[PDB]
Design a protein around this nucleic acid. Structure first.
Lengths: 26, 94, 38, 136, 141
RNA sequence: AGCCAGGAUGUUGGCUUAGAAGCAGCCAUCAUUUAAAGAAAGCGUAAUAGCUCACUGGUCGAGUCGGCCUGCGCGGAAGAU
């Protein structure tokens, strides 16, 4: 869903990045 | 050596001045000496041609009008803000 | 030939030839210089 | 590129841009770019123009630059609902109005000079024109 | 008779007349017989001290006859030779290198009179001075 | 504008390429008989060569040429019944 709220989305992108920081260095 | 056409102005103020500048003429007052200042309506293209030489800013030079041979030096030049055109020029006597 | 938004000359050979209602550019020397739409 | 080192306020109003420039006279140099147009010059614009003009006469000659930015120009982020505060400073710009001189040049051949300003003019958002100092 | 039928000009050094990097394709070859030229030029080698370029007409007819016809040697290589540089101008002409007497390149310039094509002697000697700045050096003046 | 010729010598200018030669990159533009001719114009040759330029000679006879302020024009210009 998209909804248009700002903070409701950057959390998701934050998760998406936070996983990549681990998965890269592994 | 320079010689210049002239006629006395009557109309003055911004409106009449624009009516001249649109008409390929420009205002230019002449003073110096103890006597009263006298504004003149110069032609544009003539002076614009003649002034291009640098000496024009320094050479003593006449301005014919009613045979009185005004004979003056340049004092100031209001160039247009962004066009090869003129606005107004001071002619002090010498 | 590049059409290009602004043709102009390249080679001194280039001639600048209008045809129909549209600009074209030709050079006897190099073929590459052909152009249209200027 | 090129912003004031210190500022009296973090932010500033949009204002307007009515009027005509004072700097209509080449001064530091002998050759110049009068503006004719009206508008904004972002710092990166004047900088790109400066580079394009610097690689032209190369190291010989000299280039004065008349304009300076100091006008902060803020923006809202990517997709926020209006008006929960004025936006943060984004990029400095120098406003201009017609008659403004932009760049000035030192002892360089006039033809090479027109080459240089012909190069630098393309980067600028506004239109320009070449000019010469006049003795008086 | 300066109208050679098939010239390929190439100034040659005194040192040899028939190797390959100097003489040969560099002077071209088509009916040319350098194998005798070794018997030809080296007398002119013997005329004066070695190690200098010797400019020479490459007289070449289609008639199989051909001859070297030596030109008097160029002033510039002679000036690098006297100045003693073992490279070239290297540094800009703003920095002069060579140092020679003023009567020289006039008693030295006179050596080239056979190939100097001006009229006035001093304009000619000055042509040798142009050959002097050609090195990027300038003789004292 | 065209048509007939030269368009240069010292000198491959020093150099940089094992070979820069006007033309692979500099230094520099300096001096030359001569109508005059760039130690350097493009093409081209590995480098050279070779082929057209500025100057000029006749021929042809008279308008031609680069910029300036100007009104109206074209290209830029692709969208869904």
């Amino acid at each position: 869903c998209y909804g248009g709220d700002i903070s409701r989305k950057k959390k998701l992108l934050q998760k998406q990045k936070e996983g990549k920081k681990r998965m890269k260095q592994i | 050596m320079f010689t210049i056409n002239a006629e006395v102005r009557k109309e003055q103020g911004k409106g009449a001045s624009r009516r001249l500048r649109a008409a390929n003429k420009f205002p230019a007052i002449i003073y110096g000496g103890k006597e009263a200042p006298l504004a003149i309506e110069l032609d544009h293209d003539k002076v614009m041609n003649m002034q291009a030489k640098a000496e024009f800013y320094s050479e003593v030079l006449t301005i014919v009008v009613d045979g009185k041979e005004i004979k003056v030096k340049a004092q100031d030049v209001q160039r247009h803000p962004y066009k090869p055109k003129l606005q107004h020029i001071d002619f002090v006597r010498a | 030939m590049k059409v290009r938004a602004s043709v102009k000359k390249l080679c001194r050979n280039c001639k600048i030839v209008k045809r129909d209602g549209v600009i074209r550019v030709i050079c006897s020397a190099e073929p590459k210089h052909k152009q249209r739409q200027g | 590129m090129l912003q004031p080192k210190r500022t009296k306020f973090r932010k500033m109003h949009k204002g307007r841009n009515r009027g005509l420039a004072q700097g209509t006279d080449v001064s530091f140099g002998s050759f110049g770019l009068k503006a004719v147009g009206r508008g904004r010059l972002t710092a990166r614009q004047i900088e790109a123009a400066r580079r394009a003009m610097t690689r032209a006469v190369k190291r010989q000659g000299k280039i004065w630059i008349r304009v300076f930015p100091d006008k902060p120009i803020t923006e809202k982020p990517l997709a926020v609902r209006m008006g929960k505060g004025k936006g943060n400073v984004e990029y400095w710009v120098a406003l201009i109005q017609p008659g403004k001189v932009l760049y000035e040049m030192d002892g360089v051949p006039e033809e090479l000079a027109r080459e240089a300003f012909k190069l630098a003019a393309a980067k600028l958002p506004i239109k320009t024109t070449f000019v010469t100092k006049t003795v008086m | 008779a300066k109208k050679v039928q098939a010239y390929v000009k190439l100034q040659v050094a005194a040192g040899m007349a028939n190797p390959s990097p100097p003489v040969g394709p560099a002077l071209g070859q088509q009916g040319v017989n350098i194998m005798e030229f070794c018997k030809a030029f080296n007398a002119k080698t013997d005329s004066i001290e070695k190690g200098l370029p010797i400019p020479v007409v490459i007289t070449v007819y289609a008639d199989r006859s051909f001859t070297f016809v030596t030109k008097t040697p160029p002033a510039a290589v002679l000036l690098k030779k006297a100045a003693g540089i073992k490279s070239g101008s290297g540094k800009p002409n703003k920095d002069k290198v060579g140092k020679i007497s003023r009567a020289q390149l006039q008693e030295i310039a006179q050596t080239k009179a056979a190939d100097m094509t001006g009229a006035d002697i001093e304009a000619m000697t000055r042509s040798i001075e142009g050959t002097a700045r050609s090195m990027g050096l300038v003789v004292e003046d």
